[PDB]
Coordinates of C-alpha atoms in Angstrom, one line a residue:
Chain A
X1 CA 0.0 0.0 0.0
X2 CA 1.0 3.6 -0.6
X3 CA -0.7 6.0 1.8
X4 CA -4.0 4.4 2.8
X5 CA -5.5 4.1 6.3
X6 CA -7.6 1.5 8.2
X7 CA -9.5 2.5 11.3
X8 CA -9.5 0.4 14.4
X9 CA -9.1 0.5 18.2
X10 CA -11.3 2.5 20.5
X11 CA -11.1 6.1 21.7
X12 CA -13.0 8.5 23.8
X13 CA -12.4 12.2 23.4
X14 CA -13.8 13.9 26.5
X15 CA -15.4 12.2 29.5
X16 CA -16.5 14.7 32.2
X17 CA -18.6 14.0 35.3
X18 CA -19.5 10.3 34.7
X19 CA -19.3 6.8 36.0
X20 CA -17.7 4.5 33.4
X21 CA -17.2 0.9 34.2
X22 CA -19.2 -1.8 36.0
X23 CA -18.4 -4.6 33.5
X24 CA -17.0 -2.7 30.5
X25 CA -14.7 -3.7 27.7
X26 CA -13.1 -0.6 26.2
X27 CA -10.4 -1.2 23.7
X28 CA -9.4 -3.8 21.1
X29 CA -9.8 -7.5 21.6
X30 CA -8.3 -9.8 19.0
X31 CA -7.8 -13.6 18.8
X32 CA -6.0 -15.6 16.1
Chain B
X1 CA -3.8 0.7 -2.9
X2 CA -2.8 4.4 -3.5
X3 CA -4.6 6.7 -1.0
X4 CA -7.9 5.0 0.0
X5 CA -9.4 4.7 3.5
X6 CA -11.4 2.0 5.3
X7 CA -13.4 2.9 8.4
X8 CA -13.3 0.8 11.5
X9 CA -13.0 0.8 15.3
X10 CA -15.2 2.7 17.6
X11 CA -15.0 6.3 18.9
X12 CA -17.0 8.6 21.1
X13 CA -16.3 12.3 20.7
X14 CA -17.8 13.9 23.8
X15 CA -19.4 12.2 26.8
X16 CA -20.5 14.6 29.5
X17 CA -22.6 13.9 32.7
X18 CA -23.4 10.2 31.9
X19 CA -23.2 6.6 33.2
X20 CA -21.6 4.4 30.5
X21 CA -21.1 0.7 31.2
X22 CA -23.0 -2.0 33.0
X23 CA -22.2 -4.7 30.5
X24 CA -20.8 -2.7 27.6
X25 CA -18.5 -3.7 24.7
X26 CA -16.9 -0.5 23.3
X27 CA -14.2 -1.1 20.7
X28 CA -13.1 -3.6 18.1
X29 CA -13.5 -7.3 18.6
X30 CA -12.0 -9.5 15.9
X31 CA -11.4 -13.3 15.6
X32 CA -9.6 -15.2 12.9
Chain C
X1 CA -7.6 1.4 -5.8
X2 CA -6.7 5.1 -6.3
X3 CA -8.5 7.4 -3.8
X4 CA -11.7 5.6 -2.8
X5 CA -13.3 5.2 0.6
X6 CA -15.2 2.5 2.4
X7 CA -17.2 3.3 5.6
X8 CA -17.1 1.1 8.6
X9 CA -16.8 1.1 12.4
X10 CA -19.1 2.9 14.7
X11 CA -18.9 6.5 16.1
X12 CA -20.9 8.7 18.3
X13 CA -20.3 12.5 18.0
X14 CA -21.8 14.0 21.1
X15 CA -23.4 12.2 24.1
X16 CA -24.5 14.5 26.8
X17 CA -26.6 13.7 30.0
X18 CA -27.4 10.0 29.2
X19 CA -27.2 6.4 30.4
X20 CA -25.5 4.3 27.7
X21 CA -24.9 0.6 28.3
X22 CA -26.8 -2.2 30.0
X23 CA -25.9 -4.8 27.5
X24 CA -24.6 -2.8 24.6
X25 CA -22.3 -3.7 21.7
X26 CA -20.7 -0.5 20.3
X27 CA -18.0 -0.9 17.8
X28 CA -16.9 -3.4 15.1
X29 CA -17.3 -7.1 15.5
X30 CA -15.7 -9.2 12.8
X31 CA -15.1 -13.0 12.5
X32 CA -13.3 -14.9 9.7
Chain D
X1 CA -11.5 2.1 -8.7
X2 CA -10.6 5.8 -9.1
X3 CA -12.4 8.0 -6.6
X4 CA -15.6 6.2 -5.6
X5 CA -17.2 5.7 -2.2
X6 CA -19.1 3.0 -0.4
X7 CA -21.1 3.7 2.7
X8 CA -20.9 1.5 5.7
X9 CA -20.6 1.3 9.4
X10 CA -22.9 3.1 11.9
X11 CA -22.8 6.7 13.3
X12 CA -24.8 8.9 15.5
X13 CA -24.3 12.6 15.3
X14 CA -25.8 14.0 18.5
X15 CA -27.4 12.1 21.4
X16 CA -28.6 14.5 24.2
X17 CA -30.6 13.5 27.3
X18 CA -31.4 9.9 26.4
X19 CA -31.1 6.2 27.6
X20 CA -29.4 4.2 24.8
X21 CA -28.7 0.5 25.4
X22 CA -30.6 -2.4 27.0
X23 CA -29.7 -4.9 24.4
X24 CA -28.4 -2.8 21.6
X25 CA -26.0 -3.6 18.7
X26 CA -24.5 -0.4 17.4
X27 CA -21.8 -0.8 14.8
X28 CA -20.7 -3.1 12.1
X29 CA -21.0 -6.9 12.5
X30 CA -19.4 -9.0 9.7
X31 CA -18.7 -12.7 9.3
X32 CA -16.9 -14.5 6.5
Chain E
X1 CA -15.3 2.9 -11.6
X2 CA -14.4 6.6 -11.9
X3 CA -16.3 8.7 -9.4
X4 CA -19.5 6.8 -8.4
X5 CA -21.0 6.3 -5.0
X6 CA -22.9 3.4 -3.3
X7 CA -24.9 4.1 -0.2
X8 CA -24.8 1.8 2.8
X9 CA -24.5 1.6 6.5
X10 CA -26.8 3.4 9.0
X11 CA -26.7 6.8 10.4
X12 CA -28.8 9.0 12.7
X13 CA -28.3 12.7 12.6
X14 CA -29.8 14.1 15.8
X15 CA -31.3 12.1 18.6
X16 CA -32.6 14.4 21.5
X17 CA -34.6 13.4 24.6
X18 CA -35.3 9.7 23.7
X19 CA -35.0 6.0 24.7
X20 CA -33.2 4.1 22.0
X21 CA -32.6 0.4 22.5
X22 CA -34.4 -2.5 24.1
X23 CA -33.5 -5.1 21.4
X24 CA -32.2 -2.9 18.6
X25 CA -29.8 -3.6 15.7
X26 CA -28.4 -0.3 14.4
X27 CA -25.6 -0.6 11.9
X28 CA -24.5 -2.9 9.1
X29 CA -24.7 -6.7 9.4
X30 CA -23.1 -8.7 6.6
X31 CA -22.4 -12.4 6.1
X32 CA -20.5 -14.1 3.3
Chain F
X1 CA -26.8 -16.9 17.9
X2 CA -24.3 -14.7 16.0
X3 CA -25.1 -11.1 16.5
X4 CA -28.7 -10.7 17.3
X5 CA -30.2 -8.7 20.2
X6 CA -33.0 -9.1 22.6
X7 CA -34.4 -6.6 25.2
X8 CA -34.9 -7.8 28.7
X9 CA -35.0 -6.9 32.3
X10 CA -36.6 -3.6 33.3
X11 CA -37.1 -1.4 30.4
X12 CA -35.8 2.1 29.4
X13 CA -36.9 5.2 31.3
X14 CA -40.2 3.8 32.6
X15 CA -42.6 5.2 35.2
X16 CA -41.3 8.7 34.6
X17 CA -42.8 10.7 37.5
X18 CA -45.5 8.1 38.0
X19 CA -47.1 8.4 41.5
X20 CA -47.7 4.8 42.6
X21 CA -49.7 3.5 45.5
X22 CA -47.8 0.3 45.9
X23 CA -47.9 -3.4 45.2
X24 CA -46.6 -3.3 41.7
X25 CA -44.2 -5.8 40.2
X26 CA -42.1 -4.5 37.4
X27 CA -39.6 -6.1 35.0
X28 CA -39.0 -9.7 33.9
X29 CA -39.8 -12.1 36.7
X30 CA -42.1 -14.9 37.9
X31 CA -44.2 -15.0 41.1
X32 CA -45.2 -18.3 42.8
Chain G
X1 CA -23.1 -17.0 21.1
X2 CA -20.7 -14.8 19.2
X3 CA -21.4 -11.1 19.6
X4 CA -25.1 -10.7 20.4
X5 CA -26.5 -8.6 23.3
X6 CA -29.3 -8.9 25.7
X7 CA -30.6 -6.4 28.2
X8 CA -31.1 -7.6 31.8
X9 CA -31.2 -6.6 35.4
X10 CA -32.8 -3.3 36.3
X11 CA -33.2 -1.1 33.3
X12 CA -31.9 2.4 32.3
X13 CA -33.0 5.5 34.1
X14 CA -36.3 4.2 35.4
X15 CA -38.7 5.6 38.0
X16 CA -37.3 9.1 37.4
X17 CA -38.8 11.2 40.2
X18 CA -41.5 8.6 40.8
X19 CA -43.1 9.0 44.3
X20 CA -43.8 5.5 45.4
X21 CA -45.8 4.3 48.4
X22 CA -44.0 1.0 48.9
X23 CA -44.1 -2.7 48.2
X24 CA -42.8 -2.6 44.7
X25 CA -40.4 -5.3 43.2
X26 CA -38.3 -4.0 40.4
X27 CA -35.9 -5.7 38.1
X28 CA -35.3 -9.3 37.0
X29 CA -36.1 -11.7 39.8
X30 CA -38.4 -14.4 41.1
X31 CA -40.5 -14.4 44.3
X32 CA -41.6 -17.6 46.0
Chain H
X1 CA -19.5 -17.0 24.4
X2 CA -17.0 -14.9 22.4
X3 CA -17.7 -11.2 22.7
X4 CA -21.4 -10.7 23.5
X5 CA -22.8 -8.6 26.4
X6 CA -25.6 -8.8 28.8
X7 CA -26.9 -6.2 31.3
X8 CA -27.4 -7.3 34.8
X9 CA -27.5 -6.3 38.4
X10 CA -29.0 -2.9 39.3
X11 CA -29.4 -0.7 36.3
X12 CA -28.0 2.6 35.2
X13 CA -29.1 5.9 36.9
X14 CA -32.4 4.6 38.3
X15 CA -34.8 6.1 40.8
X16 CA -33.4 9.6 40.2
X17 CA -34.8 11.7 42.9
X18 CA -37.6 9.2 43.6
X19 CA -39.2 9.7 47.1
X20 CA -39.9 6.2 48.3
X21 CA -41.9 5.0 51.3
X22 CA -40.1 1.7 51.8
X23 CA -40.3 -2.0 51.2
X24 CA -39.0 -2.0 47.6
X25 CA -36.6 -4.7 46.3
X26 CA -34.5 -3.5 43.4
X27 CA -32.1 -5.3 41.1
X28 CA -31.5 -8.9 40.1
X29 CA -32.4 -11.2 43.0
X30 CA -34.8 -13.8 44.3
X31 CA -36.9 -13.8 47.5
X32 CA -37.9 -17.0 49.3
Chain I
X1 CA -15.9 -17.0 27.6
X2 CA -13.4 -15.0 25.6
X3 CA -14.0 -11.3 25.9
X4 CA -17.7 -10.7 26.7
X5 CA -19.0 -8.5 29.4
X6 CA -21.9 -8.7 31.9
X7 CA -23.1 -6.0 34.3
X8 CA -23.6 -7.1 37.9
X9 CA -23.7 -5.9 41.5
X10 CA -25.2 -2.6 42.3
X11 CA -25.6 -0.4 39.2
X12 CA -24.2 2.9 38.1
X13 CA -25.2 6.2 39.8
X14 CA -28.5 4.9 41.1
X15 CA -30.8 6.6 43.7
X16 CA -29.4 10.0 42.9
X17 CA -30.8 12.2 45.7
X18 CA -33.6 9.8 46.4
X19 CA -35.2 10.3 49.8
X20 CA -35.9 6.8 51.1
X21 CA -38.0 5.8 54.1
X22 CA -36.2 2.5 54.7
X23 CA -36.4 -1.3 54.2
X24 CA -35.1 -1.3 50.6
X25 CA -32.8 -4.1 49.3
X26 CA -30.7 -2.9 46.4
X27 CA -28.3 -4.8 44.2
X28 CA -27.8 -8.5 43.2
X29 CA -28.7 -10.7 46.1
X30 CA -31.1 -13.3 47.5
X31 CA -33.2 -13.1 50.7
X32 CA -34.3 -16.3 52.5
Chain J
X1 CA -12.3 -17.0 30.8
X2 CA -9.7 -15.1 28.8
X3 CA -10.3 -11.4 29.0
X4 CA -14.0 -10.7 29.8
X5 CA -15.3 -8.5 32.5
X6 CA -18.2 -8.5 35.0
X7 CA -19.4 -5.8 37.3
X8 CA -19.9 -6.8 40.9
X9 CA -20.0 -5.6 44.5
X10 CA -21.4 -2.2 45.3
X11 CA -21.8 -0.1 42.2
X12 CA -20.3 3.2 41.0
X13 CA -21.3 6.5 42.6
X14 CA -24.6 5.3 44.0
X15 CA -26.9 7.0 46.5
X16 CA -25.4 10.4 45.7
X17 CA -26.8 12.7 48.4
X18 CA -29.7 10.3 49.1
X19 CA -31.2 10.9 52.6
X20 CA -32.0 7.5 53.9
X21 CA -34.1 6.5 56.9
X22 CA -32.4 3.2 57.6
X23 CA -32.6 -0.5 57.1
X24 CA -31.3 -0.7 53.6
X25 CA -29.0 -3.5 52.3
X26 CA -26.9 -2.4 49.4
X27 CA -24.5 -4.4 47.2
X28 CA -24.1 -8.0 46.3
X29 CA -25.0 -10.2 49.2
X30 CA -27.4 -12.8 50.7
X31 CA -29.5 -12.5 53.8
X32 CA -30.6 -15.6 55.8
Chain K
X1 CA -41.9 21.1 32.5
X2 CA -42.2 17.4 33.3
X3 CA -40.5 15.3 30.6
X4 CA -40.7 17.2 27.4
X5 CA -38.0 17.7 24.7
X6 CA -37.0 20.6 22.4
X7 CA -34.8 19.9 19.4
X8 CA -31.8 22.0 18.5
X9 CA -28.2 22.0 17.5
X10 CA -26.9 20.3 14.4
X11 CA -25.7 16.7 13.9
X12 CA -24.4 14.6 11.0
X13 CA -24.6 10.8 11.4
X14 CA -22.3 9.4 8.8
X15 CA -20.1 11.3 6.4
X16 CA -18.0 9.0 4.2
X17 CA -15.8 9.9 1.2
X18 CA -16.7 13.7 1.0
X19 CA -15.3 17.3 1.0
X20 CA -17.1 19.3 3.7
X21 CA -16.2 22.9 4.2
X22 CA -15.2 25.8 2.0
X23 CA -17.2 28.4 3.9
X24 CA -19.5 26.3 6.1
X25 CA -21.3 27.0 9.3
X26 CA -22.1 23.7 11.1
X27 CA -23.5 24.0 14.5
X28 CA -25.5 26.4 16.7
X29 CA -25.1 30.2 16.4
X30 CA -27.1 32.2 19.0
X31 CA -27.0 35.9 20.0
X32 CA -28.9 37.6 22.8
Chain L
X1 CA -37.8 21.6 35.1
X2 CA -38.1 17.8 36.0
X3 CA -36.5 15.6 33.3
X4 CA -36.7 17.5 30.0
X5 CA -34.0 17.9 27.3
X6 CA -32.9 20.7 25.0
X7 CA -30.7 19.9 22.0
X8 CA -27.7 22.0 21.1
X9 CA -24.1 22.0 20.0
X10 CA -22.8 20.1 17.0
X11 CA -21.7 16.6 16.5
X12 CA -20.4 14.4 13.7
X13 CA -20.7 10.6 14.2
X14 CA -18.4 9.1 11.6
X15 CA -16.1 10.9 9.1
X16 CA -14.1 8.6 6.9
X17 CA -11.8 9.4 3.9
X18 CA -12.7 13.2 3.6
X19 CA -11.3 16.8 3.6
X20 CA -13.1 18.8 6.2
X21 CA -12.1 22.4 6.7
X22 CA -11.1 25.3 4.5
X23 CA -13.0 28.0 6.3
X24 CA -15.3 25.9 8.5
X25 CA -17.1 26.7 11.8
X26 CA -18.0 23.5 13.6
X27 CA -19.4 23.9 17.0
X28 CA -21.4 26.3 19.1
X29 CA -20.9 30.1 18.8
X30 CA -22.8 32.2 21.4
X31 CA -22.7 35.9 22.2
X32 CA -24.6 37.7 25.0
Chain M
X1 CA -33.7 21.9 37.6
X2 CA -34.0 18.3 38.6
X3 CA -32.5 16.0 35.9
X4 CA -32.6 17.8 32.6
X5 CA -29.9 18.2 29.9
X6 CA -28.8 20.9 27.5
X7 CA -26.6 20.0 24.5
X8 CA -23.6 22.1 23.6
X9 CA -20.0 21.9 22.5
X10 CA -18.7 20.0 19.5
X11 CA -17.6 16.4 19.1
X12 CA -16.4 14.2 16.3
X13 CA -16.7 10.4 16.9
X14 CA -14.4 8.9 14.3
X15 CA -12.1 10.6 11.8
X16 CA -10.1 8.2 9.7
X17 CA -7.9 9.0 6.7
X18 CA -8.7 12.7 6.3
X19 CA -7.3 16.3 6.2
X20 CA -9.0 18.4 8.8
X21 CA -8.0 22.0 9.2
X22 CA -6.9 24.8 7.0
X23 CA -8.9 27.5 8.7
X24 CA -11.2 25.6 11.0
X25 CA -13.0 26.4 14.2
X26 CA -13.9 23.3 16.1
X27 CA -15.3 23.7 19.5
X28 CA -17.2 26.2 21.6
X29 CA -16.7 30.0 21.2
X30 CA -18.6 32.1 23.7
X31 CA -18.5 35.9 24.5
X32 CA -20.3 37.8 27.2
Chain N
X1 CA -29.6 22.3 40.2
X2 CA -30.0 18.7 41.2
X3 CA -28.4 16.3 38.6
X4 CA -28.6 18.1 35.2
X5 CA -25.9 18.4 32.5
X6 CA -24.7 21.0 30.1
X7 CA -22.6 20.1 27.1
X8 CA -19.5 22.1 26.1
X9 CA -15.9 21.9 25.1
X10 CA -14.6 19.9 22.1
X11 CA -13.6 16.3 21.7
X12 CA -12.4 14.0 19.0
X13 CA -12.8 10.2 19.6
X14 CA -10.5 8.6 17.1
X15 CA -8.2 10.3 14.6
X16 CA -6.2 7.8 12.5
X17 CA -4.0 8.5 9.4
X18 CA -4.7 12.2 9.0
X19 CA -3.3 15.8 8.9
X20 CA -5.0 18.0 11.4
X21 CA -3.9 21.6 11.8
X22 CA -2.8 24.3 9.4
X23 CA -4.7 27.1 11.2
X24 CA -7.1 25.2 13.5
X25 CA -8.8 26.2 16.7
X26 CA -9.8 23.0 18.6
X27 CA -11.2 23.5 22.0
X28 CA -13.1 26.1 24.0
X29 CA -12.5 29.8 23.6
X30 CA -14.4 32.1 26.1
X31 CA -14.2 35.8 26.8
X32 CA -16.0 37.8 29.5
Chain O
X1 CA -25.5 22.7 42.7
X2 CA -25.9 19.1 43.8
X3 CA -24.4 16.7 41.2
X4 CA -24.5 18.4 37.8
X5 CA -21.8 18.6 35.1
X6 CA -20.6 21.2 32.6
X7 CA -18.5 20.1 29.7
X8 CA -15.4 22.1 28.6
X9 CA -11.8 21.8 27.6
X10 CA -10.6 19.8 24.6
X11 CA -9.6 16.1 24.4
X12 CA -8.4 13.7 21.7
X13 CA -8.8 10.1 22.4
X14 CA -6.6 8.3 19.9
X15 CA -4.3 9.9 17.3
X16 CA -2.3 7.3 15.3
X17 CA -0.1 8.0 12.2
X18 CA -0.8 11.7 11.7
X19 CA 0.8 15.3 11.5
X20 CA -1.0 17.5 14.0
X21 CA 0.1 21.1 14.3
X22 CA 1.3 23.8 11.9
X23 CA -0.6 26.6 13.6
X24 CA -2.9 24.8 15.9
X25 CA -4.7 25.9 19.1
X26 CA -5.7 22.8 21.1
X27 CA -7.0 23.4 24.5
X28 CA -8.9 26.0 26.5
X29 CA -8.3 29.7 26.0
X30 CA -10.2 32.0 28.4
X31 CA -9.9 35.8 29.1
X32 CA -11.7 37.8 31.7
Chain P
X1 CA -17.4 40.1 11.8
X2 CA -18.3 37.9 14.7
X3 CA -18.4 34.2 13.7
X4 CA -19.0 34.0 10.0
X5 CA -17.0 31.9 7.5
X6 CA -15.7 32.3 4.0
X7 CA -13.9 29.8 1.8
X8 CA -10.7 30.9 0.1
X9 CA -7.5 29.8 -1.4
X10 CA -7.3 26.6 -3.3
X11 CA -10.4 24.5 -2.8
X12 CA -11.0 21.0 -1.3
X13 CA -9.9 17.9 -3.1
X14 CA -9.7 19.4 -6.6
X15 CA -8.3 18.0 -9.8
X16 CA -8.5 14.5 -8.5
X17 CA -6.5 12.4 -11.0
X18 CA -6.8 15.1 -13.7
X19 CA -4.2 14.7 -16.4
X20 CA -3.2 18.2 -17.3
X21 CA -1.1 19.5 -20.2
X22 CA 0.2 22.6 -18.5
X23 CA -0.3 26.4 -18.2
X24 CA -3.1 26.3 -15.7
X25 CA -3.5 28.8 -12.8
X26 CA -5.4 27.5 -9.9
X27 CA -6.6 29.1 -6.7
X28 CA -7.3 32.7 -5.6
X29 CA -4.8 35.1 -7.3
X30 CA -4.3 37.9 -9.8
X31 CA -2.1 37.9 -12.9
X32 CA -0.7 41.2 -14.3
Chain Q
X1 CA -13.0 39.8 14.0
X2 CA -14.1 37.7 16.9
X3 CA -14.2 34.0 16.0
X4 CA -14.8 33.7 12.3
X5 CA -12.7 31.6 9.9
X6 CA -11.4 31.9 6.3
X7 CA -9.8 29.3 4.2
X8 CA -6.6 30.3 2.4
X9 CA -3.3 29.2 1.0
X10 CA -3.2 25.9 -0.9
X11 CA -6.3 23.8 -0.3
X12 CA -6.9 20.4 1.2
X13 CA -5.8 17.2 -0.5
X14 CA -5.7 18.7 -4.0
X15 CA -4.2 17.2 -7.2
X16 CA -4.5 13.7 -5.9
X17 CA -2.6 11.6 -8.3
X18 CA -2.8 14.2 -11.0
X19 CA -0.2 13.7 -13.7
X20 CA 0.9 17.3 -14.7
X21 CA 3.0 18.4 -17.6
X22 CA 4.3 21.6 -16.0
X23 CA 3.8 25.3 -15.7
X24 CA 1.0 25.3 -13.2
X25 CA 0.7 27.9 -10.4
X26 CA -1.3 26.7 -7.5
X27 CA -2.5 28.4 -4.3
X28 CA -3.1 32.0 -3.3
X29 CA -0.6 34.3 -5.0
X30 CA 0.0 37.0 -7.6
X31 CA 2.2 37.0 -10.7
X32 CA 3.6 40.2 -12.2
Chain R
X1 CA -8.7 39.5 16.2
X2 CA -9.8 37.4 19.2
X3 CA -9.9 33.7 18.3
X4 CA -10.5 33.4 14.6
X5 CA -8.5 31.2 12.2
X6 CA -7.2 31.4 8.7
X7 CA -5.6 28.8 6.5
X8 CA -2.4 29.8 4.8
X9 CA 0.9 28.5 3.4
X10 CA 0.9 25.2 1.6
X11 CA -2.2 23.2 2.2
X12 CA -2.8 19.8 3.8
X13 CA -1.8 16.6 2.1
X14 CA -1.7 18.0 -1.5
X15 CA -0.2 16.4 -4.6
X16 CA -0.6 12.9 -3.2
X17 CA 1.3 10.7 -5.6
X18 CA 1.1 13.3 -8.4
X19 CA 3.8 12.8 -11.1
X20 CA 4.9 16.3 -12.1
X21 CA 7.0 17.4 -15.0
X22 CA 8.3 20.5 -13.4
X23 CA 7.9 24.3 -13.3
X24 CA 5.1 24.4 -10.8
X25 CA 4.8 27.0 -8.0
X26 CA 2.9 25.8 -5.0
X27 CA 1.7 27.6 -1.9
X28 CA 1.2 31.3 -0.9
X29 CA 3.7 33.5 -2.7
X30 CA 4.2 36.2 -5.3
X31 CA 6.4 36.0 -8.4
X32 CA 7.9 39.2 -10.0
Chain S
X1 CA -4.4 39.2 18.4
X2 CA -5.5 37.2 21.4
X3 CA -5.7 33.5 20.6
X4 CA -6.3 33.0 16.9
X5 CA -4.3 30.8 14.6
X6 CA -3.0 30.9 11.0
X7 CA -1.4 28.2 8.9
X8 CA 1.8 29.2 7.2
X9 CA 5.0 27.9 5.8
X10 CA 5.1 24.5 4.1
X11 CA 1.9 22.6 4.7
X12 CA 1.2 19.2 6.3
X13 CA 2.2 15.9 4.7
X14 CA 2.4 17.3 1.1
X15 CA 3.8 15.6 -2.0
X16 CA 3.4 12.2 -0.5
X17 CA 5.3 9.9 -2.9
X18 CA 5.1 12.5 -5.7
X19 CA 7.7 11.8 -8.4
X20 CA 8.9 15.3 -9.5
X21 CA 11.0 16.3 -12.4
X22 CA 12.4 19.5 -10.9
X23 CA 12.0 23.2 -10.8
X24 CA 9.2 23.4 -8.3
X25 CA 9.0 26.1 -5.6
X26 CA 7.0 25.0 -2.6
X27 CA 5.8 26.9 0.5
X28 CA 5.3 30.5 1.4
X29 CA 7.9 32.7 -0.4
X30 CA 8.5 35.3 -3.0
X31 CA 10.7 35.1 -6.1
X32 CA 12.2 38.2 -7.8
Chain T
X1 CA -0.1 38.9 20.6
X2 CA -1.2 36.9 23.7
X3 CA -1.4 33.2 22.9
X4 CA -2.1 32.7 19.2
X5 CA -0.1 30.4 16.9
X6 CA 1.2 30.5 13.4
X7 CA 2.8 27.7 11.3
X8 CA 6.0 28.5 9.6
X9 CA 9.2 27.2 8.2
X10 CA 9.2 23.8 6.5
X11 CA 6.0 21.9 7.2
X12 CA 5.3 18.6 8.9
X13 CA 6.2 15.3 7.3
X14 CA 6.4 16.5 3.7
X15 CA 7.8 14.9 0.6
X16 CA 7.4 11.4 2.2
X17 CA 9.2 9.1 -0.1
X18 CA 9.1 11.6 -3.0
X19 CA 11.7 10.9 -5.7
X20 CA 12.8 14.3 -6.8
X21 CA 15.0 15.2 -9.8
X22 CA 16.4 18.4 -8.3
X23 CA 16.1 22.2 -8.3
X24 CA 13.3 22.4 -5.8
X25 CA 13.1 25.2 -3.2
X26 CA 11.1 24.1 -0.1
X27 CA 10.0 26.1 2.9
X28 CA 9.5 29.8 3.8
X29 CA 12.1 31.8 1.9
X30 CA 12.7 34.4 -0.8
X31 CA 14.9 34.1 -3.9
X32 CA 16.5 37.2 -5.5

């Protein structure tokens, strides 16, 4: 490939005043 | 490929004043 | 390909004052 | 291809004051 | 192809003051 | 199943400002 | 299952400002 | 299962400012 | 399981400013 | 399991400024 | 008000393979 | 107000393979 | 107010393979 | 206020393979 | 205020393989 | 002006794969 | 001005894979 | 000005894989 | 100015893999 | 100025793998 791009992963820009969790999978999970 | 783009992954721009979770899968899950 | 684009993944621009979760799959799930 | 585009994935622009979840699949699910 | 476009995926512009979920499939589901 | 979805449990944003008197049973259950 | 989702437990943002009197049973349970 | 998700337990942001009287049983349980 | 997720226990941000009277049982439990 | 996640115990940020009267049982437990 | 909703702002769900700009106002512009 | 919601701001869910800019106002502009 | 929500700001969920800028205002601009 | 939320600021979830800048204002600009 | 939240600032979740800068203001700029 | 916007300079994504021969003058300029 | 925006200079992603022959003048300039 | 923005100079990601022949003048300049 | 921004100089990620022949003048300059 | 920003000089990550022939003048300069 020359200059192409493939999106992946997980991202959260701004998280203000919140409860995040309680059984959460945030990210990239890969099995081969 | 020359300059093309393929979307993937997961992203959240702004999360303000919220509860996020309780059994949540946020991201990219791949199996081969 | 030269400059083409293929949409994928999942994205949420703005999430303000909400409950998001409770058994949610947010992202890209691929199996080969 | 030269400059063409193929839509895919899932996106939500603005989500304000809501409950989103409770058994929800939001994204791209592909199996080959 | 030269400059053509094929629509796909799923998108929601603005969602304000709502309950979205409870057994919902929002996105692109493909099997080959 | 592969990627389906099913709502369950208590719902989303129910009983909003609903003055009860009592005795109610709300959700997904079984009474013997 | 692979990547499906199911809501369960208590819901999302229920009973918002709901004046009760008592006795209620809320969620996913079983009473004997 | 591989990567699915299921809500459970108490919910998300429930009973917001809900004046109770008593006796309620909230969540995912069983009473004998 | 591989990478799934399940909510459980007490929830997220529940009972926000909720004047109780007493007697409530909240979470994921069992009463005999 | 490999890399999954499960919420448990008391929750996240519950009972925020909630005037109780007493008697409540909160979390993940069992009463005999 | 009790539970009502007023729509506003601007949101774009999915934008794939496009040129957006060149003198564009995208959002909410308010003067008092 | 009790539980109502007012939409505002600007959000873009997914932007893949594009040029965005060149004299663009994306957001909320308020003057009092 | 009790539990209401007002949308504002600017957020972009996913931006993959793009040029963003060249005279761009992305955010919240307020003058009093 | 009791539990309400006001959106603001600027956030970008995922930015992959891009040029961002060249005269860009990304954030919150306030004058009083 | 009791438990409310006001969004502000600027945040970028994931930035991979990019050029960011060349005359960029990323953050919060306030004058009183 | 307060918050308006005007496109200028070279455009967005022009001349995509356009075989020229020469001599062209492209943008916002003036030739004497 | 307060918070406006104007594109200028060379554009965004122009001339993508455009075989030239020569002589072109591209951008925002003036030739005497 | 207060917080405005203006693109300038060479652009963003221009001439991607563009076979030239020579002689071009690219950017924001003036030739006498 | 207070907090504005202006692109200038050479751009961002230009000429990616662009086979030249020679003679080009790139950036923000002036030739006499 | 107070806190503004201006790009200048050579750019960011330009000419990536660009086979030249010679003679080019790159950056922010002036030739007499």
